[PDB]
Amino acid sequence: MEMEKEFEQIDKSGSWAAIYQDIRHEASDFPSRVAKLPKNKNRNRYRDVSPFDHSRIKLHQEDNDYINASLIKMEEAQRSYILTQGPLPNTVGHFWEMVWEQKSRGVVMLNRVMEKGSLKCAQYWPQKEEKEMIFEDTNLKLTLISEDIKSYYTVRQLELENLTTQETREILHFHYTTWPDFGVPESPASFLNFLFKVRESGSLSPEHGPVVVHCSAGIGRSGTFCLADTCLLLMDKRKDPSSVDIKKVLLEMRKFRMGLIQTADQLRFSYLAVIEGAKFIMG
Ligand SMILES: Oc1ccccc1CN1CCOCC1
Ligand SMILES: Oc1ccccc1CN1CCOCC1
């Protein structure tokens, strides 16, 4: 069923809460035993947001391989994403170890460091060229190379050095800075423009490891970003773009990480974003 007429229909009947609860009831439940081990309590931001065992990213070390991060592998679309929490003071070294080990070219950040007067993630990248960061626990160095500040997003070029081998790589930091403290954006236009900038960078392409995507918990805004990207690619792959079922794609992604899309308003915004992104690509 075409999504745009459908959208107006779901609006007219005011049933977003009921649709969202149907998704919550049908979502996968898989074990997260590693996340819940007592030795990992200070590696989780939120007690109710954990990676499944089957899809968790493992750190390459014998001591403790745990990070709150999941591999979302979309078979038909041929896209993969790592979705992770905003890094904590004691996991900033693990975060950059993961980017290094997974061969990622891009990090996508959808939150501010402070929102609602509280800290939503650590200041995990350097703010000045001449003040680099060293992560002694994982033996990495990170340098700010350049910063481009725009009205709706900032893009940074970073240099990550593995101090063990003296190898270096160029990481692109895509920072969406305008998501409102409460609710969702009124228009999806700036979010869709941002998605198009990440795509045009090569960060989502199969010659690199998966993009790393985060917000504060790594399920709400982060879920909206991957859901919109996969749905729009499927529309360009299929003979019938109207066959793409956003609720079925979201339930496929929920096989790999719990809780993706945290509210009925985020569900509406995703449908909104896919509907408006379809129109712009059309011709
Ligand atoms: O290298 C890219 C290619 C396509 C898109 C984006 C980038 C990253 N740029 C951000 C700041 O300007 C120089 C690098
Ligand atoms: O790439 C195209 C060119 C002309 C017409 C249609 C498409 C497919 N779009 C459908 C809407 O969703 C994104 C792809």
Swiss-Prot record:
Positions of post-translational Cysteine sulfenic acid (-SOH) modification: C215
Domain of life: Eukaryota
Topology in membrane: Peripheral membrane protein
One Gene Ontology CC term in the entry: mitochondrial matrix
N-acetylmethionine found at: M1
EC number: 3.1.3.48
Record: residues binding substrate: D181, C215, S216, A217, G218, I219, G220, R221, Q262
Ranges for domain Tyrosine-protein phosphatase: 3-277
Family: Belongs to the protein-tyrosine phosphatase family. Non-receptor class 1 subfamily.
Assembly behavior: Interacts with EPHA3 (phosphorylated); dephosphorylates EPHA3 and may regulate its trafficking and function. Interacts with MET. Interacts with NCK1.
Name of the protein described by the UniProt record: Tyrosine-protein phosphatase non-receptor type 1
Organism: Homo sapiens (Human)
Lineage: Eukaryota, Metazoa, Chordata, Craniata, Vertebrata
